[PDB]
Amino acid sequence: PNIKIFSGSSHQDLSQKIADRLGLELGKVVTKKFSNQETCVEIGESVRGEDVYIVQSGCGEINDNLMELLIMINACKIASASRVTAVIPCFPYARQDKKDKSRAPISAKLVANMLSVAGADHIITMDLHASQIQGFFDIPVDNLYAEPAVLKWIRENISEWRNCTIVSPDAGGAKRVTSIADRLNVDFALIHKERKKANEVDRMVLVGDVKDRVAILVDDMADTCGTICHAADKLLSAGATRVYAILTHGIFSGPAISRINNACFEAVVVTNTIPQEDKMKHCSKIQVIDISMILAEAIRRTHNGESVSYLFSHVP
Amino acid sequence: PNIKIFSGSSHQDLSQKIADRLGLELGKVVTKKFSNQETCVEIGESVRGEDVYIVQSGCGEINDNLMELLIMINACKIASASRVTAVIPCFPYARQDKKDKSRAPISAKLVANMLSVAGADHIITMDLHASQIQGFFDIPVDNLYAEPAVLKWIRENISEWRNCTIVSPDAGGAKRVTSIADRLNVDFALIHKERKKANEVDRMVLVGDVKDRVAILVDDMADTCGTICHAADKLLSAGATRVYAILTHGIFSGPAISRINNACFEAVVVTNTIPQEDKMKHCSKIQVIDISMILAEAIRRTHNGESVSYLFSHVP
Amino acid sequence: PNIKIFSGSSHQDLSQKIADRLGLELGKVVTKKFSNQETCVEIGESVRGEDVYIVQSGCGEINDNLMELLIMINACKIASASRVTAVIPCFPYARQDKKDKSRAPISAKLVANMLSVAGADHIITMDLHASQIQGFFDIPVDNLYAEPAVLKWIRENISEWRNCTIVSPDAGGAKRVTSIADRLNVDFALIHKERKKANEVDRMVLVGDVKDRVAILVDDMADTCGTICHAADKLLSAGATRVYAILTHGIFSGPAISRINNACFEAVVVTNTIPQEDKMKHCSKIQVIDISMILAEAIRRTHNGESVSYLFSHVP
Amino acid sequence: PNIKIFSGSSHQDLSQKIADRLGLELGKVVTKKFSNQETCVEIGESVRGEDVYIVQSGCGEINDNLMELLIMINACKIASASRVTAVIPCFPYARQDKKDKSRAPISAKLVANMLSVAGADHIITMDLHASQIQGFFDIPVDNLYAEPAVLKWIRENISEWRNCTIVSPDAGGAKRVTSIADRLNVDFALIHKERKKANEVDRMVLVGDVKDRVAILVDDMADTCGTICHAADKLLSAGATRVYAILTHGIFSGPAISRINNACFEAVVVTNTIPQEDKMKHCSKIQVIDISMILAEAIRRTHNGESVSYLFSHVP
Amino acid sequence: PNIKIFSGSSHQDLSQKIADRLGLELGKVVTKKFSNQETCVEIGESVRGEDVYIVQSGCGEINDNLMELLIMINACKIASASRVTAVIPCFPYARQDKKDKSRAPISAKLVANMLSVAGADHIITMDLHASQIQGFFDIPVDNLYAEPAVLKWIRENISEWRNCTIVSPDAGGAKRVTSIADRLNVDFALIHKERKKANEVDRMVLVGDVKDRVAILVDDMADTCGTICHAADKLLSAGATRVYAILTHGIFSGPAISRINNACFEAVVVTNTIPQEDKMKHCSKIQVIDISMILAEAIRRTHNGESVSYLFSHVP
């Protein structure tokens, strides 16, 4: 079997980068819409007995892209592909990973079941919002970390990183922030927005010392940037000299760009798990860490039957 | 269909309390071992068209108890029970909820699959180590909270609770601690044991102020009590006046009892999701919050087709 | 794909013998218990695209070992093994193969379903208590016979084997005894313990002539040795000169060792599907037929895509 | 839900007897063949929310009848029946219950899987050739015994039954014969046809004493009657005064009728799990035990959610 | 893996032709009936790791043949075949492809489910009665067309084919007839038998002009030939000079041979998806298009991982 890399409509630049790093051309696919807005998928080459990797991030037109991915997976399976792997850099519906409300769906589990029934044999993803999403499948799920790339960026772009403090913008980010602070041998802090019992002012509590130090906000994603912007205001109010925000998934939906442009961030750093070209044109603060080499190495090692553990300590 | 409550060998006192609160006698079951240590299950009454609830905590002889539960579920299903619900107050293998190591099993997902294939239609559990374990099943999973009972105990047993600080013993407990601190309108702190890069001394970092205040350690479980004991030493070293530990699952395996007896805890508070009678005989610091009323109300509402949302704000 | 042989905690000497006969080292696995007695499995090498064989007998801590086997199977499957085969020399819960009582579980079927959901693709076992257990799976199940090794032992160790009579200790062993008697061209007899209608003395009926002849008791297993010991008393009372007992699974649980030491057996012969080192130290009558060559040949032929029919007529 | 009894083409007289004992009319079904010999099933009434019981024995045109049963089960399921139960008095392919030959199918398991995928929720059958066939399903399987009816017939029709010996025609029938002999408090014997190593004369070995006593051959089925006829010749050669044959499934295929007419049987007794009207017209020795009351009681108790254990000790 | 071609009892001449075109001998299989008319399948060689193709048409003893095919598929799967493909030239129960009546089964879906549960990994068939039957499976289904062979026969055997009109015998054949007429650049007509509201005379309506032209009836199958015979009478009554009938599946059950012999057909042309040797002996009008080369090429390309699209434009 040979590696066949197919791109959905979501992140075709990332698919191209992965294919170039693998020394391959992208597989021939026409991914369009019928007139009635139904997804049209036209695989333009044989995938018989091939090791098919479909790159599709959960971003942009989320349901459009997920349906595109499912249809492409099913087409490859019925076309007798040896193995179909869904490379989903940003897993859609990952934040709907539990039922903590009455009648609430576990949409991440539904997406996992849909991918399984479409015929996916393997999932490659980066920085799942909850790592337990790996357990939502009965197939192997690669949950790659952007943490080595984040550490590289911090050590190369922040002069006073050895005296910095890594800040969690919410309680759920504590593990990620503590891991990064341990790897950098720096202090960490946590910011919590307390629960909205009524319609008074949202107030943020900070635990840890950030006074007269550079604060690096690290989180898994910035959708509306309410979390990171509120954390940034709190950090400046607490005496932080400079505030950075580093995310792996830059969704930047809704008012995020205006929020960041009016915030105090020295830089907002995201990976290219989601296309950022449009976002960077309206926000100069955004910088992008390319993770295409990580995904390409993961695909290559999956095809060659080699461990991907190397990707959790080094940036290829 | 009628409620049939069956007890495994793990926590029969809790099963009795649930049955009494439901105004029922426990179903007739003989749960023993064959000579070769294979689990022997002898259901002593018809469950045809009945709503069967099997109470079995993940504690004691873990694999023995889980096999007992699976065999009882399968026997009830083949005996044409209308519905089989596994009441698992402490979910076994819940800490193995992700693959963050090479070749690591997701044992929680395997346990969920085993329960599903045994024929469970419903799971009732308390304070899952990861709430995403709800997504490991395709059946409804009730993840009950001991938090209302914990808040009741704090308000009734700690005189200075309004000036206390709720402390997370690790980074993963941050959400639970922030929720409790919000409900009590008190400060919170977090304690992190940094990663063991080599064989030097384990050192703990505390973020937040606990000086001259009562510190309440809140966590989901205390297995060996290394986490809570190390956190307690750190809290006293940081100037805490008194230190409490409140858990929902008191496993207290291995050296936990000696650790607690030699620690500085004012009280170690656990629920009775795991039997504590033996533990209390060797550690006077342990106190037990009865959660049998919560489980009984959950079972009764499940049988009657009523919401269990009331259990997340009140202790019945 | 390459053969990877992994040992559970149950029978590691047999796993070592199989690996030596295959010219391989055992795969690196740490199979221990967490403090709370949950099974801990740490596969120490890649199994990507490998043909994994996990050796785990149903013996000793039965539920412990079965959970170990299931966790190891699931870990290998999620670790992208090409194929996972469970080598289970003595199938656990094999005697619970039917529902002939109200509410009785079919525990063998539950174990088969658990192995299937863990991800086993192939089962290799020896002398299933019921051969229909092969039908409990939807995957191929190799039910190897110890009969050629038993015939070899009889012809090499019993001088008057041509005038012996092979005796079934119960009605269920009749097929095995008739097959062995046909292969040896000798007489056979059957012993039946009639059903316990009340609390009077257990009485045994013998059909067939054993007077002044060597009697060989052949059965699939000896758990408590009540069956073989009662049959031995009956055979001596019926005029048998010498009495042998040949089993394939020597469980020897409970009072079996004292029963055998106080019985009249010339020799109790078992295979090493279950470890016998401890049993032989307390009972000199026990002798062991090594079947590691049969299992090793079965594994080798399974890997090479060759028939295992040769194993049913010859001992390699 | 109401009981709906539907008859296949196999045994419509038995279906009528069951319906009369249940005080019901048979459900309206047209079960014919299309011109190209495809099975045509036309259910003539609504089964929405009904408790559907389909009576179809494995006899006559075996594959025709099994396909008829599967199509009727699937039609009832798609027609929104509350529950579909397959009443299969003689389970087809039951003798293909294991893989003891290279490349041999387990046809009983395939039939079970086909019934499961057709949508059967419950199986009611009589005297499975192997009771482990219950484990071939994941649904409840009722394996009713004709033994109480057989004991009733023996006590009412054989004057010297207290001095009789119950004879197994092969090694596999030993459990059934020992159970019957225990219930009658009589002796038992076993007859074995040794394996055909070459083309010499088939010779039968008898263990047990039948001289000058009435011999009752008891087996689960008589297909070609080679087993019972050879056993009858052996029993007469051994000095039996009279020889009876009692089966639960009278298949009587091929040369069975001529074999019985030329045999020495006092009577050949079968149940009506298979239609016997044609067989009795050509063989006066055949007598029929009606088991329609057992099946009707089983269906009624299944519908009413009552235990069928009463059917294993009494004939209703 | 190597191609292994196994023949069922249905169409062994076609299997032989396929094997010869593949340069192979048919796999050793004994496909007979037990005495009680149960299907007996004895695969006479190893299929371990082999690419197994089982040829079995839906014809003759339909349920017999389908059960034979299912048993052979399951035997090959349990015998550890690498892949099992069911080559079903005429799909049985294909006309039962929808539920347009109360309580009607979808027998085609049931057959698909039975093939899936037997373990088929791939289906190769010719001219499905409904192409949507491909969607009844979750495995790849090759729906080969006899249309190129039909066009070849028309261009080589009908001198005035350029002035002919291709006639649909019913409304459902319109797509097939329009496709053929487009490929031949000829006119088309449609014949409809209006619905039987009462017991008056069946009357046929013809849309299109067939006067003084050769009419070619093209349909997917001729079971009883009522459709084609009635269409032929209508076509002659409408002024057609000569009438041909071309089918891909010649079932010719029941009165079809007498109907054709008394009809006005110049020739009745069928493929050999169903054996026609017996039919041709009683009807000189029947001619056979060999499609064994199409099936052999499909099998060869499936084994070699090559597209079968070439088969839809050319006859190999």
Ligand SMILES: Nc1ncnc2c1ncn2[C@@H]1O[C@H](COP(=O)(O)OP(=O)(O)O)[C@@H](O)[C@H]1O
């Ligand atoms: N795509 C989404 N965008 C915004 N909010 C979401 C989205 N999906 C889910 N949510 C909401 O956010 C919740 C998850 O919140 P999160 O901050 O991820 O962690 P936690 O629920 O543990 O506090 C969900 O329960 C739901 O109410």
Ligand SMILES: Nc1ncnc2c1ncn2[C@@H]1O[C@H](COP(=O)(O)OP(=O)(O)O)[C@@H](O)[C@H]1O
């Ligand atoms: N150091 C690590 N940190 C986090 N996750 C890891 C780590 N090592 C492995 N994993 C997880 O395990 C998966 C597979 O691990 P890997 O080492 O590539 O080999 P194997 O597939 O045999 O386990 C990765 O995709 C990742 O999800």
Ligand SMILES: Nc1ncnc2c1ncn2[C@@H]1O[C@H](COP(=O)(O)OP(=O)(O)O)[C@@H](O)[C@H]1O
């Ligand atoms: N029963 C157990 N007892 C002790 N350690 C366990 C147990 N089950 C799993 N573990 C280990 O603990 C890890 C889980 O650690 P935990 O403190 O729950 O959270 P995190 O892994 O997110 O830091 C597992 O990956 C495994 O290495």
Ligand SMILES: Nc1ncnc2c1ncn2[C@@H]1O[C@H](COP(=O)(O)OP(=O)(O)O)[C@@H](O)[C@H]1O
């Ligand atoms: N306030 C809450 N906090 C956390 N989990 C909740 C809450 N309300 C509901 N749940 C979860 O939802 C499950 C079922 O919710 P419930 O309100 O009883 O009704 P429904 O089953 O219709 O959703 C509970 O068992 C629990 O797991």
Ligand SMILES: Nc1ncnc2c1ncn2[C@@H]1O[C@H](COP(=O)(O)OP(=O)(O)O)[C@@H](O)[C@H]1O
């Ligand atoms: N591990 C076990 N040890 C002892 N008895 C067992 C065990 N498992 C099941 N049993 C009991 O033994 C019965 C099986 O008996 P056995 O001698 O194997 O054959 P039979 O039931 O056909 O007479 C089961 O139905 C159950 O009552």
Ligand SMILES: Nc1ncnc2c1ncn2[C@@H]1O[C@H](COP(=O)(O)OP(=O)(O)O)[C@@H](O)[C@H]1O
């Ligand atoms: N002579 C035999 N006696 C009993 N079982 C047998 C015999 N031959 C084969 N089997 C069964 O069939 C299985 C597989 O058979 P084998 O001859 O190795 O080839 P295949 O897998 O192609 O059938 C064996 O593992 C065993 O369970």
Ligand SMILES: Nc1ncnc2c1ncn2[C@@H]1O[C@H](COP(=O)(O)OP(=O)(O)O)[C@@H](O)[C@H]1O
């Ligand atoms: N319908 C049938 N009619 C005749 N023989 C059959 C039938 N089905 C299977 N067989 C054969 O008989 C064998 C089963 O033999 P049986 O007497 O029931 O018990 P055992 O195989 O345990 O000696 C099968 O393995 C097969 O070879």
Ligand SMILES: Nc1ncnc2c1ncn2[C@@H]1O[C@H](COP(=O)(O)OP(=O)(O)O)[C@@H](O)[C@H]1O
């Ligand atoms: N005495 C018995 N002998 C044999 N099989 C029995 C006996 N009692 C029950 N069974 C089996 O168990 C099945 C169901 O048992 P039953 O007593 O009716 O209640 P339940 O379904 O709750 O187990 C029966 O259909 C039969 O297969």
Ligand SMILES: Nc1ncnc2c1ncn2[C@@H]1O[C@H](COP(=O)(O)OP(=O)(O)O)[C@@H](O)[C@H]1O
């Ligand atoms: N093997 C068969 N032989 C004859 N008629 C059949 C067969 N299978 C199904 N039928 C009947 O024919 C119907 C299908 O008719 P057909 O001419 O194929 O198309 P349509 O139903 O779309 O008009 C089925 O609904 C059923 O009533």
Ligand SMILES: Nc1ncnc2c1ncn2[C@@H]1O[C@H](COP(=O)(O)OP(=O)(O)O)[C@@H](O)[C@H]1O
């Ligand atoms: N021109 C066509 N007309 C009709 N069906 C087609 C055509 N091309 C392909 N198919 C269908 O697609 C199946 C597989 O197509 P093929 O071109 O062989 O490659 P792939 O399997 O990769 O799709 C065929 O078996 C057939 O059912």
Ligand SMILES: O=P(O)(O)OC[C@H]1O[C@H](O)[C@H](O)[C@@H]1O
């Ligand atoms: O749009 P925002 O909610 O600010 O950003 C997404 C956040 O929501 C979730 O907690 C994620 O972990 C992030 O912290």
Ligand SMILES: O=P(O)(O)OC[C@H]1O[C@H](O)[C@H](O)[C@@H]1O
């Ligand atoms: O025995 P210990 O590890 O101290 O207690 C169990 C802890 O391990 C996990 O993090 C749980 O969340 C607890 O904090």
Ligand SMILES: O=P(O)(O)OC[C@H]1O[C@H](O)[C@H](O)[C@@H]1O
């Ligand atoms: O401990 P024991 O019951 O004596 O030995 C196990 C027996 O139980 C079952 O019948 C097995 O076939 C053996 O004959």
Ligand SMILES: O=P(O)(O)OC[C@H]1O[C@H](O)[C@H](O)[C@@H]1O
């Ligand atoms: O036609 P026959 O083989 O004589 O009768 C069927 C027999 O085959 C099987 O062993 C059944 O248990 C019966 O004893």
Ligand SMILES: O=P(O)(O)OC[C@H]1O[C@H](O)[C@H](O)[C@@H]1O
């Ligand atoms: O026996 P006949 O019904 O005439 O031939 C079979 C027909 O029935 C279905 O419509 C097929 O498409 C054919 O047109």
Ligand SMILES: [Mg+2]
């Ligand atoms: Mg979250």
